[PDB]
């Protein structure tokens, strides 16, 4: 019930002012366009996927590469890091998701599983644990797989459009996905049915990510308007838009406390908003192309951004 607005509720709160984040790292070594990323729970190891058929696992602290996997196919657009750091996954338009095991053989790498059978492209694939994984298929359905068995252990139906993105709750029991129907849908990963659906958008939901408390999420549209939604509200809580530039949003993610919400546009920049007062808290610039994904460490010390420029940037 939109009896008021968040700005009215947070009126008595002063803005954080101009947020100034610095560049701590410049991860070079990628040969082609980067399409995804995921932090490990140790905030030290991260996974990056690029169209050169490569999945590279980098150590954030020491700037050096720890692992490099040559993929079967060059159309990867999503990758996820296992919370325990034992597994990685990749996949894309090939309707096949390849999963590799890390702490079984070191130095080299093994393709522990290949998930084939999808009728739609993989737009996002996400770990839940060392044995479960959720993949986004553009056939208006998603799929929950068990890596050890390789089957579509569950199918997610209810969307009427090509699913672009998803994100798990911080506790990895619930995930919200957006499709071409300009609507977002909340799902229980074990139950997989469309509980709440959010409409009103003019284009596909090109970005979606969860709030650290697992009670709210964000959406990105083509008209440069980032939107904040609550799980239970079934309506948008804040709109963060600029009229002068018409490029869409690509990725979203929140700060550890959630005072700060990050969202990148095709205008070569990312904007970080004071989530409380819709204030344009700061701008992150430096990517040599459009931003493709970004994330925050589970402990919240630093943010990583991966873009089409083939370089990852870490900000503190």
């Amino acid at each position, epitope marked *: 019930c939109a009896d008021a607005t968040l700005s009215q509720i947070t009126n008595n709160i002063d803005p954080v002012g101009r947020i100034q984040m610095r560049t701590r790292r410049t991860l070079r070594g990628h040969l082609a366009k980067i399409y995804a990323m995921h932090w490990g729970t140790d905030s030290r190891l991260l996974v990056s996927a690029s169209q050169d058929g490569k999945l590279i696992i980098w150590d954030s602290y020491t700037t050096n590469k720890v692992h490099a996997i040559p993929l079967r196919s060059s159309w990867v657009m999503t990758c996820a890091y296992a919370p325990s750091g034992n597994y990685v996954a990749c996949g894309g338009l090939d309707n096949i998701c390849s999963i590799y095991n890390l702490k079984t053989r070191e130095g080299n790498v093994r393709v522990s599983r290949e998930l084939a059978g999808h009728t739609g492209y993989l737009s996002c694939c996400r770990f839940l644990d060392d044995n479960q994984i959720v993949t986004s298929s553009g056939d208006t359905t998603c799929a929950l797989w068990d890596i050890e068995t390789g089957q579509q252990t569950t199918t997610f139906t209810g969307h009427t459009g090509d699913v672009m993105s998803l994100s798990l709750a911080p506790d990895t029991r619930l995930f919200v996905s957006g499709a071409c129907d300009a609507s977002a849908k909340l799902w229980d990963v074990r139950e997989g049915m469309c509980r709440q659906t959010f409409t009103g958008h003019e284009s596909d939901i090109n970005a979606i990510c969860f709030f650290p408390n697992g009670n709210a999420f964000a959406t990105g549209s083509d008209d440069a308007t980032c939107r904040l939604f609550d799980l239970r509200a079934d309506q948008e809580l804040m709109t963060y838009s600029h009229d002068n530039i018409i490029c869409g949003i690509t990725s979203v993610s929140f700060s550890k406390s959630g005072r700060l919400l990050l969202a990148g546009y095709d205008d070569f920049n990312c904007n970080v*908003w*004071d989530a409380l007062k819709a204030d344009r808290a700061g701008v992150l610039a430096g990517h040599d192309n459009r931003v493709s994904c970004l994330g925050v460490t589970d402990d919240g010390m630093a943010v990583a951004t991966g873009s089409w420029d083939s370089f990852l940037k870490i900000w503190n």
Partner: antibody
Amino acid sequence: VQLKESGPGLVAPSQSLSITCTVSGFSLTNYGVHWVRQPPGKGLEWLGIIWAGGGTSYDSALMSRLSISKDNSKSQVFLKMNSLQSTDTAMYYCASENYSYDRGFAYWGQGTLVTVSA
Amino acid sequence: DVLMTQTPLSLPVSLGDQASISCRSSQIIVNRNGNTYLEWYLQKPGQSPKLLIYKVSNRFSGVPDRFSGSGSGTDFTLKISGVEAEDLGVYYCFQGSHVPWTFGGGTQLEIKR
């Protein structure tokens, strides 16, 4: 830095008032703009502020009837105030906020008297 | 809901004399980042207010040095070193720490003859 205001001198009661305080000498995306009205022969009253990034803070009494919006490209900030009353007869001032001076309103608008009468 | 109560309410001051205008809020005010915002505005009759002291004690560019800004905690004071013809008007102390921000009640400074 100069703030110049323009608005309708006479407005009918309960209608919508559109006041423009076109700013100059600074980037509107980095400074706040204030609204203060002064009834004839009385002390000042506080209305609200839009912050540098577009966030808004209003007087606790006047969130519902006051609206502050801006076009950053044109250096134009617009006050939309609805449900006007006779008590709204006042010299409405737009005041700048400078972060570098830490909440000091260096520059105030010249003010335009607005009359709510038949 | 802090209120700036200003004293003295109306004090006749001769030319060249020094005058003390102190205002104390209904509650102790400090910004959450550690700053305190007391600003003194001189308003001529019917004109827009003009800032004199920003950040409690710092004079703004163009503000005459004959105005002395100081004070701490709940006590703040603007002192005038030499009173000229341009000293006529009303003086308000302003707080910018807790919203909704509030102005002082205004001090009627008058010139004797």
